[PDB]
Amino acid sequence: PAPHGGILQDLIARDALKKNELLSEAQSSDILVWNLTPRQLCDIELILNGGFSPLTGFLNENDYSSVVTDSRLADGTLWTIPITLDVDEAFANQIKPDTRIALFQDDEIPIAILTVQDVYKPNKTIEAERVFRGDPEHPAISYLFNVAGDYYVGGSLEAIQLPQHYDYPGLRKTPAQLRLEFQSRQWDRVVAFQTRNPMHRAHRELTVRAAREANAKVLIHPVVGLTKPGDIDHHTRVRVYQEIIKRYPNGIAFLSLLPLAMRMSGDREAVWHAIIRKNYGASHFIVGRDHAGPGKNSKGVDFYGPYDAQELVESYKHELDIEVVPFRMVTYLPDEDRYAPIDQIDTTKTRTLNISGTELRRRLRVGGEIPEWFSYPEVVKILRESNPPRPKQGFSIVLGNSLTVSREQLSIALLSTFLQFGGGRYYKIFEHNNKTELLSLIQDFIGSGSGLIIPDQWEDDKDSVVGKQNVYLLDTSSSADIQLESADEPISHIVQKVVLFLEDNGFFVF
Amino acid sequence: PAPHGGILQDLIARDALKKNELLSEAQSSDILVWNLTPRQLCDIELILNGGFSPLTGFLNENDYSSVVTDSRLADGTLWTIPITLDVDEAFANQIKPDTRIALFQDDEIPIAILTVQDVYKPNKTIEAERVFRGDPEHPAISYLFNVAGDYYVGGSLEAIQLPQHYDYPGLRKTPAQLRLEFQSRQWDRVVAFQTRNPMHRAHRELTVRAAREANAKVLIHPVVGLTKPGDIDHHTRVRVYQEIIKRYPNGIAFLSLLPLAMRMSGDREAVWHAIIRKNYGASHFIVGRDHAGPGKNSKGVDFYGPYDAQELVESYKHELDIEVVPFRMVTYLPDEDRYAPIDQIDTTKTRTLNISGTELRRRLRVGGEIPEWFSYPEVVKILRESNPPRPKQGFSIVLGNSLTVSREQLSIALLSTFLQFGGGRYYKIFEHNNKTELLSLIQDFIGSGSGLIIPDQWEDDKDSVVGKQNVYLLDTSSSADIQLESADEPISHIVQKVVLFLEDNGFFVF
Numbered sequence A, B: 001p002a003p004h005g006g007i008l009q010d011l012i013a014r015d016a017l018k019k020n021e022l023l024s025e026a027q028s029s030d031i032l033v034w035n036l037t038p039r040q041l042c043d044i045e046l047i048l049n050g051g052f053s054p055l056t057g058f059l060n061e062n063d064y065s066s067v068v069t070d071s072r073l074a075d076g077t078l079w080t081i082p083i084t085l086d087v088d089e090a091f092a093n094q095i096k097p098d099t100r101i102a103l104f105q106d107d108e109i110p111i112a113i114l115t116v117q118d119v120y121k122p123n124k125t126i127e128a129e130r131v132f133r134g135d136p137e138h139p140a141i142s143y144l145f146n147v148a149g150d151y152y153v154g155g156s157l158e159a160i161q162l163p164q165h166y167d168y169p170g171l172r173k174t175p176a177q178l179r180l181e182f183q184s185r186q187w188d189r190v191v192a193f194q195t196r197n198p199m200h201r202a203h204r205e206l207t208v209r210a211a212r213e214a215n216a217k218v219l220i221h222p223v224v225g226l227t228k229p230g231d232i233d234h235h236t237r238v239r240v241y242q243e244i245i246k247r248y249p250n251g252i253a254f255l256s257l258l259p260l261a262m263r264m265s266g267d268r269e270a271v272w273h274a275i276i277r278k279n280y281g282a283s284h285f286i287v288g289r290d291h292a293g294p295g296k297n298s299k300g301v302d303f304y305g306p307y308d309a310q311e312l313v314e315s316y317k318h319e320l321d322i323e324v325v326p327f328r329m330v331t332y333l334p335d336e337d338r339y340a341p342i343d344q345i346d347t348t349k350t351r352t353l354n355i356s357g358t359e360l361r362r363r364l365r366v367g368g369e370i371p372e373w374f375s376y377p378e379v380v381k382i383l384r385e386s387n388p389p390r391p392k393q394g395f396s397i398v399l400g401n402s403l404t405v406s407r408e409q410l411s412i413a414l415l416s417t418f419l420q421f422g423g424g425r426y427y428k429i430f431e432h433n434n435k436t437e438l439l440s441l442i443q444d445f446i447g448s449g450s451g452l453i454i455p456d457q458w459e460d461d462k463d464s465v466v467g468k469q470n471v472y473l474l475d476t477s478s479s480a481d482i483q484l485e486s487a488d489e490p491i492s493h494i495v496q497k498v499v500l501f502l503e504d505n506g507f508f509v510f
């Protein structure tokens, strides 16, 4: 179908004859420079390559308010997710309309020249409730208030180059490239599959089922820009993707990476994804259960209903200009060893089986077996390798403030005790002395599978520098992960307590 | 590098706006029509897509002659393999210069319009001697004499479309498409690897070494058009290539199929391959041992010296404009568990191991084990599935003319006996009644793994219609594969001789 709004706004093509000139302006001594954030990098690439057509820059207050309240750009164009350049007061104060700012990547690579239209201070609570449904634990809201600048800068963009990427040079196709790919294959019907998670048997079946339903070739279009915090990394996922694409009949599927930054915005996001897939050359788009939804909040309640996205998308059906292929929960059928949409079964008579993501993380954490029917063996292998079970995981034991015993001796005892277990883990007594340079390496070691014995705590102001993953507190306090009986509990007694705790939590298996 | 001759003669692009017009002409009642042969389809695709630049059609007597005697086109351009349109006397006689013939595929798909420049009867003896070195067993010479037309038609082409292929839709990249694939990845140095055989450890190793020495990315460019008679089918080889591509470091290699029709003309073909790969965008081309060589004839003598191709290519070095990366025999060193060119070892103090194609076929024929050091397991599995061991192979037993026992009864006896053994094979008593429509089916059954019991011989003038693989003659004559003691030998006695013969040759295993 035609790109949204009718014209693929591929600004790299458009501005090809201005590259040299633009390149020089960005590197000039007098121009104002803004280093793009990782989310702004994902967005600008989608803007510059035509993926966000009809967009040609970051939204000004007028288009943004319309998107916020109407799910449309000022001119009525259907657009549900606001794409804005968020900066701080300090930088904002340095600009006015007509100003030309140069946008860089890593303070080295010039990306584009932005021509300012306006500078405004959005009300984040309206944006938070209107676009994302207001729940503070929502990834998009949490980001909006804790990471995004308080000032947005609207303006038109002029391309210099798409953001740099060194992984998968050939796989990140632009809308124009993907289109030639389909074309060279004479693919006039293509159903796209959005995904930010690894694909399992269920996913493979619903995509093939969609291919057969729509008489279309299959496009696996995974997101490799930002997704939901805690997701399985994109490198591990590409490997899972490149592995599962081989379980499709030869010549039916095509894999392409999408550097999009999701907002995990359920129904609104699905609408957005469809627009994006149409721009990329798909004629059909899949929207399954809880599409782009972030699950449930700490209180156990749904951010979106399991089929809100399908409903919202269904309502814009006639103006989307891309065919939506909906699916109800596809589940496994033990008694028939096959997969099928829950809306075509049940009513009792047939038993169904499902393994939730929570159940999988857990199987991966304990080293438990994962059913041959659930996923493909080689996919499970790739997942176990990058998300190793507890006995292969790193961890840190932090000697609390309350300790009265010898910190030097308690550390040595823990180090020697741990070293006698063996099993390939590397241990170290780690002194951070409250230095950020050091504090920030803690999670690197844990990520490497190492066990760190930490002699004393870091001051509270520094706490934010350290991830708390697999970091455990030894102390007399009630908030200690490993609770001491007394501040001066003898060393041997403490070592046993720590050893058995680490074993109870699977770090040690004898 | 620049295409051979300066311009990529991509006639599909050149004639894009003439497509509808050329199609109309091609389908007019009046126009003379010639249906392309398989080799011609291979050659026409390479001419129409620019793979054969500077060629823009099939050679006229002038260029053809130059090439045969001079390894150059009339204008001096280096070119070693004549590419001509061979037709029969009947067709040639209707042709006149300045005429426009329509070239079709499968007598239905119009491929191109040929404007004739001349029609001539080449001296096939000179061509066989000068271009293919004269041995009558050389595939190129056998083809030249038993299949190719006796008249050549030189003329320029106007493209309607490249030949149709429904297998591997996106893998047959045209020179323009590959050049784009490379550019999108920023690949400016690419070393190409030619091949018509499955790839094993040695091949992976030499292509990577080539990548390292030349500081270039890798292009696996296998031939999927005509190759040597008896080669592993291209579908099987493609699966092999697709599997082995995964054993290269991520992002270092690209797979692209080449619809070339080889002539197995060693050194001359090597130069030709260099020119072709240059046209497809490669900056380097690998030339190993006995490049494009068909091996040895009947008397065991070599068609080419193992390094003639390297010598010829070297002598045209400054003309080729594509860097040749030569390799001496790459072999296995058991004691160091690695592969290496033989020129950089031996000293008669270093052990080397190798498995010839002959040794491999054989290991596959008996279901023998293949060293994990020789090839990757996934590759071997694919090879066994397509070229299965004798117990999984089909065969035919032909009751010879000499036989005086009941053909009907001997047939049933053989059928009932084979059926006792089980093992999956399907058996049928097959009466051809000397009808070629039936005789032509014998090899399909053998190909299907079946056992055929054929009660009587077919006319001598029909032998050509029937393949020879796994077809055995039961007779009293010396030419019998299973020789009877007398034409009236009792059935049970004949049955035992047959059963034990098939066991001796592996078809049955108890």
Ligand SMILES: Nc1ncnc2c1ncn2[C@@H]1O[C@H](COP(=O)(O)OS(=O)(=O)O)[C@@H](O)[C@H]1O
Pocket (backbone or CB within 6 Å): A194, A195, A196, A197, A198, A202, A203, A206, A286, A287, A288, A289, A290, A291, A292, A293, A327, A328, A329, A330, A331
């Ligand atoms: N079991 C399932 N049944 C139906 N749809 C599913 C199922 N699992 C995943 N999907 C769909 O697969 C697509 C991508 O899935 P995910 O990667 O888990 O999440 S999402 O955020 O990209 O939507 C979505 O359309 C989603 O609704």
Ligand SMILES: Nc1ncnc2c1ncn2[C@@H]1O[C@H](COP(=O)(O)OS(=O)(=O)O)[C@@H](O)[C@H]1O
Pocket (backbone or CB within 6 Å): B194, B195, B196, B197, B198, B202, B206, B286, B287, B288, B289, B290, B291, B292, B293, B327, B328, B329, B330, B331
């Ligand atoms: N063991 C080897 N050592 C060096 N070169 C080899 C070896 N095996 C194959 N080659 C080279 O690999 C390329 C393709 O090999 P083949 O498919 O067997 O035959 S060819 O007809 O295309 O040359 C050729 O350059 C050939 O000379």
Ligand SMILES: [Ca+2]
Pocket (backbone or CB within 6 Å): A145, A149, A150
């Ligand atoms: Ca703020």
Ligand SMILES: [Ca+2]
Pocket (backbone or CB within 6 Å): A302, A306
């Ligand atoms: Ca729910």
Ligand SMILES: [Ca+2]
Pocket (backbone or CB within 6 Å): A486, A488
């Ligand atoms: Ca005490």
Ligand SMILES: [Ca+2]
Pocket (backbone or CB within 6 Å): B145, B149, B150
């Ligand atoms: Ca003849």
Ligand SMILES: [Ca+2]
Pocket (backbone or CB within 6 Å): B302, B306
């Ligand atoms: Ca030899």
Ligand SMILES: [Ca+2]
Pocket (backbone or CB within 6 Å): B486, B488
């Ligand atoms: Ca007798």
Ligand SMILES: [Mg+2]
Pocket (backbone or CB within 6 Å): A045, A162, A163, A164, A165, A172
């Ligand atoms: Mg990029």
Ligand SMILES: [Mg+2]
Pocket (backbone or CB within 6 Å): B045, B162, B163, B164, B165, B172, B259
């Ligand atoms: Mg073709």
Ligand code: NA
Pocket (backbone or CB within 6 Å): A001, A002, A321
């Ligand atoms: Na349209």
Ligand code: NA
Pocket (backbone or CB within 6 Å): A106, A107, A108
């Ligand atoms: Na820097």
Ligand code: NA
Pocket (backbone or CB within 6 Å): A304, A305, A308
């Ligand atoms: Na709802």
Ligand code: NA
Pocket (backbone or CB within 6 Å): A318, A319, A321
């Ligand atoms: Na419409």
Ligand code: NA
Pocket (backbone or CB within 6 Å): A323
């Ligand atoms: Na439809």
Ligand code: NA
Pocket (backbone or CB within 6 Å): A504
């Ligand atoms: Na416990």
